[PDB]
Amino acid sequence: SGTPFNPKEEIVVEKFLPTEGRKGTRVVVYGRNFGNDVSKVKVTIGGYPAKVINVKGESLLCICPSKAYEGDVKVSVVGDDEAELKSGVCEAKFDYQYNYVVTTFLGKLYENNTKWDVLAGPFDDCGAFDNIWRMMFDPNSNYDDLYWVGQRDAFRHVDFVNQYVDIKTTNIGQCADVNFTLNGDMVVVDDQSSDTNTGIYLFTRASGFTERLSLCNARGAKTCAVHPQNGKIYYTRYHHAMISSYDPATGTLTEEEVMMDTKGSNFHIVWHPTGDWAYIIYNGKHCIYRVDYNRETGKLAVPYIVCGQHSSPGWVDGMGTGARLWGPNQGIFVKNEAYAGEEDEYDFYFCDRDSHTVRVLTPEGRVTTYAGRGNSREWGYVDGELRSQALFNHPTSIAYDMKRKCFYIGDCDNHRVRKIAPEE
Ligand SMILES: [Cl-]
Ligand SMILES: [Cl-]
Ligand SMILES: [Cl-]
Ligand SMILES: [Cl-]
C-alpha cells in the first residue's frame, strides 16, 4: 500500500518501465494519486484492460494485455459506487511489441487429422475443406464475403456476418479461378476440354449470385484476371501460348492480346492495383513474369521474367532470377507502408505450394520467405511463429483481409483455412 487516493487532486501518469514489451509483460506505472486500493484502480494500455497486481500511491504494477497497439497508458480510480472519479494518461505511449503467428481459422478434422466431413455449416462446425484452390473477397462486401473455387471439389462461401461457410452450387465441373467484374458480377472459369463449350461463366450480383450466364467458349482455361480500369477479363488456355481477353461490357474477344513463351501449363494472372501491369505466375514452371499494359494503345507488352528460373523448382530466397520457386500458386498485392510515396506501394505475397511457404516478391524483384518451413521441417501442420515454428502442407490460395488486418491461407493438404495475424 501507500498514500490514500485524494479526490481533490488529478491522477498524473509520469512514466512506465519497461517502455516496451509484449503481452504478459509486467509494467510498473509511476505517477501521482493512484491510491492504495487495487480493486479501485483501473489501467488500460491501448484501450485494453490490464490486470493490476499492486498499487502503492505513486506506482502500480500491471500486466500488459494483448492488442495494446495504440499504446496509451491510462490510469483511473473509481469510487465505492464503481463510478470513475479521476483518470490520467501518460504523454509517452507504451511500445507494444508482437510477433505475427500462423493460426487455424476454419476447418476441423478427426482421427488424428486423417478424416473430415464436407458440409455447409457454422464457422465452428463446417467440417473441413477438400480443395482451397483460389480465393477472392467480394469487393462490394467490405470484407464480409470470401469465396473460393475448389477445381472439381466444392466452391465455398465464407460469410462473416452470419459466421457460416456455405457450399455454392455452380454446376461447373472444374472451377479453376474466380474474380469479379467492375460491375461486381462474379466470374468463374471452367477448365474443360471442348473448344465449343463455355470456359468463362458469370454469376450476377443482382440475383445474389444465383443466376449463371455463359460469357465465352474457351477450352482448357486456367485464370481470369479483371483489369481494374478497362474491365476486361484476361485469361489463358492450355493449348495456346498467349494471353486472351473477353470484354464483358461489349462481348469483344481478343484471342491474342500478346504471345507467351509457354503453354500447356497452369498460369495465374494478377493485375497490379494501378492496372499498369500484371504478374503472370507460371504455376507449373516455377517462375513469375510481368506483362506491362500500355494505357494509350490498350495493348500488352512482351512478358518478361521477374523471378525464379523456368523449369527449375527449388526453395531459394534471393534477387530476381537468382531466386528459386516451387509451385507458386495464388498471389495478391498488399500495401506496404514502408513504400509510401514510391512508384510501387505494394508487396506481392504468394503461396509457394511445393516449398510449403508463403513468400513475398518486392518491387525490386527480391523474393523472401514470409511463413512456413518451421521446426527444421518442410511440410506439416503446426501453428505458431512464422519461420521458427509454423508448417503448412501445400499452401495454395491467399487473401488479405484489410478490415481485420490478416491473411487467410488455403492450406490444401491440411484441409484448413489458416490465418496470419498478430499474436493475441
Ligand atoms: Cl469443401
Ligand atoms: Cl486481377
Ligand atoms: Cl524473359
Ligand atoms: Cl503503387
Side-chain angles (χ1 to χ4, degrees), residues 239-265:
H239 291 288
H240 299 281
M242 63 195 58
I243 300 169
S244 303
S245 70
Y246 173 83
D247 186 347
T250 64
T252 297
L253 287 146
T254 301
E255 187 169 8
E256 193 181 300
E257 289 278 359
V258 73
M259 294 300 305
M260 282 179 62
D261 67 6
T262 305
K263 61 175 178 174
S265 197

PDB file of all heavy atoms in Angstrom, residues 239-265:
ATOM      1  N   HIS A 239      -3.948 -24.970 -74.618  1.00  0.00           N
ATOM      2  CA  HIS A 239      -3.361 -25.288 -75.908  1.00  0.00           C
ATOM      3  C   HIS A 239      -2.838 -24.110 -76.738  1.00  0.00           C
ATOM      4  O   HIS A 239      -2.482 -24.295 -77.909  1.00  0.00           O
ATOM      5  CB  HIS A 239      -4.360 -26.072 -76.734  1.00  0.00           C
ATOM      6  CG  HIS A 239      -4.607 -27.445 -76.209  1.00  0.00           C
ATOM      7  ND1 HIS A 239      -3.672 -28.454 -76.318  1.00  0.00           N
ATOM      8  CD2 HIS A 239      -5.675 -27.977 -75.559  1.00  0.00           C
ATOM      9  CE1 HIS A 239      -4.164 -29.558 -75.775  1.00  0.00           C
ATOM     10  NE2 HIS A 239      -5.379 -29.301 -75.318  1.00  0.00           N
ATOM     11  N   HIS A 240      -2.768 -22.928 -76.135  1.00  0.00           N
ATOM     12  CA  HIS A 240      -2.439 -21.699 -76.858  1.00  0.00           C
ATOM     13  C   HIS A 240      -1.401 -20.904 -76.026  1.00  0.00           C
ATOM     14  O   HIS A 240      -1.599 -20.664 -74.822  1.00  0.00           O
ATOM     15  CB  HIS A 240      -3.742 -20.926 -77.098  1.00  0.00           C
ATOM     16  CG  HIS A 240      -4.711 -21.702 -77.932  1.00  0.00           C
ATOM     17  ND1 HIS A 240      -4.592 -21.780 -79.299  1.00  0.00           N
ATOM     18  CD2 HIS A 240      -5.717 -22.541 -77.587  1.00  0.00           C
ATOM     19  CE1 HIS A 240      -5.541 -22.583 -79.770  1.00  0.00           C
ATOM     20  NE2 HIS A 240      -6.231 -23.061 -78.750  1.00  0.00           N
ATOM     21  N   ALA A 241      -0.306 -20.506 -76.663  1.00  0.00           N
ATOM     22  CA  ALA A 241       0.753 -19.740 -75.957  1.00  0.00           C
ATOM     23  C   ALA A 241       0.499 -18.239 -76.091  1.00  0.00           C
ATOM     24  O   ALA A 241       1.128 -17.567 -76.922  1.00  0.00           O
ATOM     25  CB  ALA A 241       2.131 -20.084 -76.521  1.00  0.00           C
ATOM     26  N   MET A 242      -0.376 -17.728 -75.238  1.00  0.00           N
ATOM     27  CA  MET A 242      -0.817 -16.339 -75.341  1.00  0.00           C
ATOM     28  C   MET A 242      -1.707 -15.973 -74.182  1.00  0.00           C
ATOM     29  O   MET A 242      -2.165 -16.849 -73.415  1.00  0.00           O
ATOM     30  CB  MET A 242      -1.586 -16.123 -76.668  1.00  0.00           C
ATOM     31  CG  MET A 242      -2.879 -16.942 -76.771  1.00  0.00           C
ATOM     32  SD  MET A 242      -3.572 -17.038 -78.581  1.00  0.00           S
ATOM     33  CE  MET A 242      -2.050 -17.821 -79.493  1.00  0.00           C
ATOM     34  N   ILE A 243      -1.914 -14.662 -74.021  1.00  0.00           N
ATOM     35  CA  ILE A 243      -2.961 -14.165 -73.169  1.00  0.00           C
ATOM     36  C   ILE A 243      -4.094 -13.689 -74.086  1.00  0.00           C
ATOM     37  O   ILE A 243      -3.874 -12.966 -75.053  1.00  0.00           O
ATOM     38  CB  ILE A 243      -2.481 -13.000 -72.297  1.00  0.00           C
ATOM     39  CG1 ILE A 243      -1.334 -13.473 -71.406  1.00  0.00           C
ATOM     40  CG2 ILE A 243      -3.634 -12.412 -71.466  1.00  0.00           C
ATOM     41  CD1 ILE A 243      -0.622 -12.331 -70.695  1.00  0.00           C
ATOM     42  N   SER A 244      -5.307 -14.095 -73.720  1.00  0.00           N
ATOM     43  CA  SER A 244      -6.519 -13.718 -74.403  1.00  0.00           C
ATOM     44  C   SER A 244      -7.330 -12.804 -73.496  1.00  0.00           C
ATOM     45  O   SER A 244      -7.063 -12.721 -72.277  1.00  0.00           O
ATOM     46  CB  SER A 244      -7.353 -14.975 -74.736  1.00  0.00           C
ATOM     47  OG  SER A 244      -6.617 -15.920 -75.536  1.00  0.00           O
ATOM     48  N   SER A 245      -8.363 -12.177 -74.043  1.00  0.00           N
ATOM     49  CA  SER A 245      -9.319 -11.456 -73.207  1.00  0.00           C
ATOM     50  C   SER A 245     -10.738 -11.510 -73.725  1.00  0.00           C
ATOM     51  O   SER A 245     -10.985 -11.692 -74.927  1.00  0.00           O
ATOM     52  CB  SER A 245      -8.948  -9.972 -73.064  1.00  0.00           C
ATOM     53  OG  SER A 245      -9.130  -9.280 -74.282  1.00  0.00           O
ATOM     54  N   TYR A 246     -11.655 -11.289 -72.784  1.00  0.00           N
ATOM     55  CA  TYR A 246     -13.057 -11.084 -73.040  1.00  0.00           C
ATOM     56  C   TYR A 246     -13.505  -9.809 -72.334  1.00  0.00           C
ATOM     57  O   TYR A 246     -13.238  -9.614 -71.136  1.00  0.00           O
ATOM     58  CB  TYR A 246     -13.886 -12.299 -72.554  1.00  0.00           C
ATOM     59  CG  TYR A 246     -15.374 -12.053 -72.654  1.00  0.00           C
ATOM     60  CD1 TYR A 246     -16.050 -12.238 -73.844  1.00  0.00           C
ATOM     61  CD2 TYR A 246     -16.094 -11.603 -71.567  1.00  0.00           C
ATOM     62  CE1 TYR A 246     -17.412 -11.993 -73.946  1.00  0.00           C
ATOM     63  CE2 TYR A 246     -17.452 -11.376 -71.646  1.00  0.00           C
ATOM     64  CZ  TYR A 246     -18.117 -11.572 -72.835  1.00  0.00           C
ATOM     65  OH  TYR A 246     -19.482 -11.318 -72.914  1.00  0.00           O
ATOM     66  N   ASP A 247     -14.164  -8.930 -73.084  1.00  0.00           N
ATOM     67  CA  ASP A 247     -14.668  -7.664 -72.542  1.00  0.00           C
ATOM     68  C   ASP A 247     -16.136  -7.781 -72.172  1.00  0.00           C
ATOM     69  O   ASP A 247     -16.994  -7.800 -73.061  1.00  0.00           O
ATOM     70  CB  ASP A 247     -14.489  -6.559 -73.573  1.00  0.00           C
ATOM     71  CG  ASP A 247     -14.852  -5.188 -73.031  1.00  0.00           C
ATOM     72  OD1 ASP A 247     -15.474  -5.091 -71.963  1.00  0.00           O
ATOM     73  OD2 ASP A 247     -14.484  -4.210 -73.677  1.00  0.00           O
ATOM     74  N   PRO A 248     -16.449  -7.790 -70.871  1.00  0.00           N
ATOM     75  CA  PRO A 248     -17.852  -8.037 -70.501  1.00  0.00           C
ATOM     76  C   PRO A 248     -18.802  -6.918 -70.874  1.00  0.00           C
ATOM     77  O   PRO A 248     -20.004  -7.174 -70.991  1.00  0.00           O
ATOM     78  CB  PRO A 248     -17.820  -8.198 -68.973  1.00  0.00           C
ATOM     79  CG  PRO A 248     -16.448  -7.855 -68.526  1.00  0.00           C
ATOM     80  CD  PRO A 248     -15.557  -7.669 -69.702  1.00  0.00           C
ATOM     81  N   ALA A 249     -18.289  -5.703 -71.061  1.00  0.00           N
ATOM     82  CA  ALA A 249     -19.142  -4.575 -71.468  1.00  0.00           C
ATOM     83  C   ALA A 249     -19.641  -4.705 -72.915  1.00  0.00           C
ATOM     84  O   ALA A 249     -20.754  -4.309 -73.231  1.00  0.00           O
ATOM     85  CB  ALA A 249     -18.399  -3.251 -71.283  1.00  0.00           C
ATOM     86  N   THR A 250     -18.817  -5.256 -73.792  1.00  0.00           N
ATOM     87  CA  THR A 250     -19.130  -5.313 -75.220  1.00  0.00           C
ATOM     88  C   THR A 250     -19.226  -6.725 -75.804  1.00  0.00           C
ATOM     89  O   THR A 250     -19.707  -6.899 -76.925  1.00  0.00           O
ATOM     90  CB  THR A 250     -18.054  -4.586 -76.030  1.00  0.00           C
ATOM     91  OG1 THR A 250     -16.809  -5.277 -75.882  1.00  0.00           O
ATOM     92  CG2 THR A 250     -17.902  -3.140 -75.560  1.00  0.00           C
ATOM     93  N   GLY A 251     -18.715  -7.722 -75.095  1.00  0.00           N
ATOM     94  CA  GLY A 251     -18.605  -9.067 -75.670  1.00  0.00           C
ATOM     95  C   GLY A 251     -17.421  -9.282 -76.596  1.00  0.00           C
ATOM     96  O   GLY A 251     -17.275 -10.360 -77.174  1.00  0.00           O
ATOM     97  N   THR A 252     -16.533  -8.292 -76.715  1.00  0.00           N
ATOM     98  CA  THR A 252     -15.407  -8.408 -77.609  1.00  0.00           C
ATOM     99  C   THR A 252     -14.378  -9.391 -77.094  1.00  0.00           C
ATOM    100  O   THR A 252     -13.969  -9.313 -75.939  1.00  0.00           O
ATOM    101  CB  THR A 252     -14.722  -7.049 -77.808  1.00  0.00           C
ATOM    102  OG1 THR A 252     -15.653  -6.163 -78.435  1.00  0.00           O
ATOM    103  CG2 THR A 252     -13.453  -7.192 -78.683  1.00  0.00           C
ATOM    104  N   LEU A 253     -13.974 -10.313 -77.968  1.00  0.00           N
ATOM    105  CA  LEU A 253     -12.947 -11.285 -77.697  1.00  0.00           C
ATOM    106  C   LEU A 253     -11.677 -10.891 -78.443  1.00  0.00           C
ATOM    107  O   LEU A 253     -11.732 -10.560 -79.628  1.00  0.00           O
ATOM    108  CB  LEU A 253     -13.397 -12.651 -78.187  1.00  0.00           C
ATOM    109  CG  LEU A 253     -14.478 -13.299 -77.339  1.00  0.00           C
ATOM    110  CD1 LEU A 253     -15.459 -14.133 -78.158  1.00  0.00           C
ATOM    111  CD2 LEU A 253     -13.817 -14.125 -76.247  1.00  0.00           C
ATOM    112  N   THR A 254     -10.555 -10.921 -77.740  1.00  0.00           N
ATOM    113  CA  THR A 254      -9.254 -10.722 -78.364  1.00  0.00           C
ATOM    114  C   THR A 254      -8.479 -11.990 -78.085  1.00  0.00           C
ATOM    115  O   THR A 254      -8.043 -12.212 -76.959  1.00  0.00           O
ATOM    116  CB  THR A 254      -8.551  -9.500 -77.755  1.00  0.00           C
ATOM    117  OG1 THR A 254      -9.383  -8.344 -77.950  1.00  0.00           O
ATOM    118  CG2 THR A 254      -7.171  -9.261 -78.403  1.00  0.00           C
ATOM    119  N   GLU A 255      -8.331 -12.834 -79.107  1.00  0.00           N
ATOM    120  CA  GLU A 255      -7.677 -14.113 -78.896  1.00  0.00           C
ATOM    121  C   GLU A 255      -6.222 -13.943 -78.467  1.00  0.00           C
ATOM    122  O   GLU A 255      -5.754 -14.647 -77.585  1.00  0.00           O
ATOM    123  CB  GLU A 255      -7.760 -14.983 -80.156  1.00  0.00           C
ATOM    124  CG  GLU A 255      -7.232 -16.374 -79.906  1.00  0.00           C
ATOM    125  CD  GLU A 255      -7.512 -17.369 -81.014  1.00  0.00           C
ATOM    126  OE1 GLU A 255      -8.005 -16.958 -82.088  1.00  0.00           O
ATOM    127  OE2 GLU A 255      -7.192 -18.571 -80.806  1.00  0.00           O
ATOM    128  N   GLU A 256      -5.493 -13.041 -79.121  1.00  0.00           N
ATOM    129  CA  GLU A 256      -4.083 -12.860 -78.843  1.00  0.00           C
ATOM    130  C   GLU A 256      -3.805 -11.428 -78.390  1.00  0.00           C
ATOM    131  O   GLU A 256      -3.424 -10.576 -79.205  1.00  0.00           O
ATOM    132  CB  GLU A 256      -3.289 -13.198 -80.104  1.00  0.00           C
ATOM    133  CG  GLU A 256      -1.795 -13.354 -79.862  1.00  0.00           C
ATOM    134  CD  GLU A 256      -1.049 -13.661 -81.145  1.00  0.00           C
ATOM    135  OE1 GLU A 256      -1.347 -14.693 -81.776  1.00  0.00           O
ATOM    136  OE2 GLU A 256      -0.164 -12.874 -81.516  1.00  0.00           O
ATOM    137  N   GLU A 257      -4.006 -11.147 -77.099  1.00  0.00           N
ATOM    138  CA  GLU A 257      -3.561  -9.858 -76.527  1.00  0.00           C
ATOM    139  C   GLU A 257      -2.045  -9.780 -76.663  1.00  0.00           C
ATOM    140  O   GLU A 257      -1.515  -8.750 -77.060  1.00  0.00           O
ATOM    141  CB  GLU A 257      -3.978  -9.699 -75.065  1.00  0.00           C
ATOM    142  CG  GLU A 257      -5.482  -9.490 -74.856  1.00  0.00           C
ATOM    143  CD  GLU A 257      -5.926  -8.058 -75.073  1.00  0.00           C
ATOM    144  OE1 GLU A 257      -5.068  -7.193 -75.377  1.00  0.00           O
ATOM    145  OE2 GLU A 257      -7.150  -7.777 -74.929  1.00  0.00           O
ATOM    146  N   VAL A 258      -1.355 -10.874 -76.335  1.00  0.00           N
ATOM    147  CA  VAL A 258       0.091 -10.980 -76.552  1.00  0.00           C
ATOM    148  C   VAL A 258       0.497 -12.436 -76.563  1.00  0.00           C
ATOM    149  O   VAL A 258      -0.143 -13.256 -75.912  1.00  0.00           O
ATOM    150  CB  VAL A 258       0.873 -10.193 -75.454  1.00  0.00           C
ATOM    151  CG1 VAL A 258       0.825 -10.899 -74.109  1.00  0.00           C
ATOM    152  CG2 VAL A 258       2.310  -9.906 -75.898  1.00  0.00           C
ATOM    153  N   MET A 259       1.554 -12.768 -77.299  1.00  0.00           N
ATOM    154  CA  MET A 259       2.114 -14.125 -77.252  1.00  0.00           C
ATOM    155  C   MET A 259       2.825 -14.340 -75.924  1.00  0.00           C
ATOM    156  O   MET A 259       3.383 -13.408 -75.336  1.00  0.00           O
ATOM    157  CB  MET A 259       3.125 -14.362 -78.380  1.00  0.00           C
ATOM    158  CG  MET A 259       2.533 -14.343 -79.772  1.00  0.00           C
ATOM    159  SD  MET A 259       1.159 -15.690 -80.029  1.00  0.00           S
ATOM    160  CE  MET A 259       2.050 -17.364 -79.547  1.00  0.00           C
ATOM    161  N   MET A 260       2.820 -15.586 -75.469  1.00  0.00           N
ATOM    162  CA  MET A 260       3.615 -16.016 -74.328  1.00  0.00           C
ATOM    163  C   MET A 260       4.636 -17.035 -74.806  1.00  0.00           C
ATOM    164  O   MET A 260       4.514 -17.621 -75.886  1.00  0.00           O
ATOM    165  CB  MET A 260       2.728 -16.617 -73.226  1.00  0.00           C
ATOM    166  CG  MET A 260       2.005 -15.578 -72.392  1.00  0.00           C
ATOM    167  SD  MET A 260       0.872 -16.400 -71.020  1.00  0.00           S
ATOM    168  CE  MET A 260       2.315 -17.282 -70.039  1.00  0.00           C
ATOM    169  N   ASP A 261       5.661 -17.247 -73.998  1.00  0.00           N
ATOM    170  CA  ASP A 261       6.736 -18.140 -74.384  1.00  0.00           C
ATOM    171  C   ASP A 261       6.483 -19.603 -73.969  1.00  0.00           C
ATOM    172  O   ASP A 261       7.296 -20.476 -74.261  1.00  0.00           O
ATOM    173  CB  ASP A 261       8.081 -17.627 -73.833  1.00  0.00           C
ATOM    174  CG  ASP A 261       8.171 -17.678 -72.314  1.00  0.00           C
ATOM    175  OD1 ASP A 261       7.272 -18.194 -71.609  1.00  0.00           O
ATOM    176  OD2 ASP A 261       9.191 -17.177 -71.806  1.00  0.00           O
ATOM    177  N   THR A 262       5.352 -19.843 -73.306  1.00  0.00           N
ATOM    178  CA  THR A 262       4.998 -21.149 -72.728  1.00  0.00           C
ATOM    179  C   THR A 262       3.497 -21.366 -72.829  1.00  0.00           C
ATOM    180  O   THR A 262       2.713 -20.445 -72.681  1.00  0.00           O
ATOM    181  CB  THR A 262       5.425 -21.184 -71.239  1.00  0.00           C
ATOM    182  OG1 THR A 262       6.820 -20.877 -71.158  1.00  0.00           O
ATOM    183  CG2 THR A 262       5.178 -22.560 -70.560  1.00  0.00           C
ATOM    184  N   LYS A 263       3.109 -22.605 -73.090  1.00  0.00           N
ATOM    185  CA  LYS A 263       1.706 -23.017 -72.997  1.00  0.00           C
ATOM    186  C   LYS A 263       1.687 -24.369 -72.309  1.00  0.00           C
ATOM    187  O   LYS A 263       2.720 -24.863 -71.851  1.00  0.00           O
ATOM    188  CB  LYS A 263       1.072 -23.109 -74.384  1.00  0.00           C
ATOM    189  CG  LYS A 263       1.720 -24.117 -75.327  1.00  0.00           C
ATOM    190  CD  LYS A 263       0.969 -24.233 -76.645  1.00  0.00           C
ATOM    191  CE  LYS A 263       1.656 -25.210 -77.583  1.00  0.00           C
ATOM    192  NZ  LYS A 263       0.827 -25.424 -78.794  1.00  0.00           N
ATOM    193  N   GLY A 264       0.521 -24.979 -72.230  1.00  0.00           N
ATOM    194  CA  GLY A 264       0.439 -26.359 -71.744  1.00  0.00           C
ATOM    195  C   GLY A 264       0.669 -26.483 -70.255  1.00  0.00           C
ATOM    196  O   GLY A 264       1.196 -27.488 -69.774  1.00  0.00           O
ATOM    197  N   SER A 265       0.247 -25.480 -69.499  1.00  0.00           N
ATOM    198  CA  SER A 265       0.586 -25.389 -68.088  1.00  0.00           C
ATOM    199  C   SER A 265      -0.423 -24.462 -67.411  1.00  0.00           C
ATOM    200  O   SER A 265      -1.222 -23.803 -68.088  1.00  0.00           O
ATOM    201  CB  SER A 265       2.032 -24.827 -67.939  1.00  0.00           C
ATOM    202  OG  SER A 265       2.563 -25.061 -66.644  1.00  0.00           O
TER     203      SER A 265
END
